[PDB]
Amino acid sequence: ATNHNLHITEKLEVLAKAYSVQGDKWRALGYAKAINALKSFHKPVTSYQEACSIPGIGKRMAEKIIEILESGHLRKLDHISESVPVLELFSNIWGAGTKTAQMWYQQGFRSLEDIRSQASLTTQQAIGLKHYSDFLERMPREEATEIEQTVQKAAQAFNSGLLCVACGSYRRGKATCGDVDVLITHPDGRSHRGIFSRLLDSLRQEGFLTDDLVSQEENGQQQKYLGVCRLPGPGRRHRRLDIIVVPYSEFACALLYFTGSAHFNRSMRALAKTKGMSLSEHALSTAVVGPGRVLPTPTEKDVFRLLGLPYREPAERDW
DNA sequence: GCCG
DNA sequence: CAGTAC
DNA sequence: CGGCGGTACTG
Ligand SMILES: Nc1ncnc2c1ncn2[C@H]1C[C@H](O)[C@@H](COP(=O)(O)OP(=O)(O)OP(=O)(O)O)O1
Ligand SMILES: [Ca+2]
Ligand SMILES: [Ca+2]
Secondary structure, three states, rough: OOOOOHHHHHHHHHHHHHHOOOOOOHHHHHHHHHHHHHOOOOOOOHHHHHHHEEEEEEEEHHHHHHHHHHHHHHHHHHHOOOOOHHHHHHHOOOOOHHHHHHHHHOOOOOHHHHOOOOOOOOOOEEEEEEHHHHHHEEHHHHHHHHHHHHHHHHHOOOOOOOEEEEHHHHOOOOOOOOOOOEEOOOOOOOOOOOHHHHHHHHHHHHHOEEEEEEEEEEEOOOOEEEEOOOOOOOOOOOOOEEEEEHHHHHHHHHHHHHHHHHHHHHHHHHHHOOOOOEOOOOEEEEEOOOOOOEEOOOOHHHHHOOOOOOOOHHHHHOO
């Protein structure tokens, strides 16, 4: 729909970003839920009382909204730390978070060139710094498709029955993507095994995979790769790529989880908890007693159904 | 930051 | 264990 | 006042 409260959310996003890079994770989360609540509200917010009735907006958030309504400006925006642009600069390095960004700032570093010459870097952060510009830009939707087809083609060379899906914002119909996550499975329930490691080998040989961030991550029977790819041809940029191989049993939940968004996932976890359940990339389960009971879910719709929730197409999962 |  | 990412 | 998910890898 249309955001009737753009004059409000524009300013709040600045604060959310400031709180974010300063390590204040929960405070940032509150702003994010608030901003989401505002831009999905059916009309302009016009009073403190009306603001408070909205779930996700309490007194402190309502005070700010009202200030914006009354004067058109937020005072807090004029008192945000001078360090925020620099901490944001450092936080856009893959492998570096707020703790690192603060350490670097406290060491006197103020630019990427300083990090490069005076700072110690993990192998991951060195790759993040090397591809900094390319990772900051979002790719055209059409490029996410080619990357998907590249992984798909290499995978079906081992087993034609394999199924590959690109999740994330791409699956949600965004015109651009921050990165690509390709989910791979097989319907026979077994042929997905033994594919992952020699798939990555193949993709390295043809020069598609350029760097590894996490070469291998084993979570249950899921296998995950985090790395960097680059399509053939002149002018092509380095892009963030994820490859997850999952068994068919967990495909619906994995699909649901990697499609996102992260806000949406969080909301579904909360909803699951109210019905005495848990939701992960692997399954929908009854709450812990020993472990819990895995409720089987062949399709994403079965997940919504077991949660007593009307299905939402991927395009409608922004939060 | 907000909620239960 | 702490930090980071998913 | 505590939860806002739980898990894996890197160092
Ligand atoms: N704290 C979390 N932060 C980010 N992603 C998470 C988190 N928890 C679960 N996920 C999931 C949801 C995401 O859809 C999935 C990977 O998607 P991701 O690349 O991070 O963003 P996105 O593809 O939805 O948007 P975009 O491409 O614009 O960055 O990881
Ligand atoms: Ca409220
Ligand atoms: Ca993505």
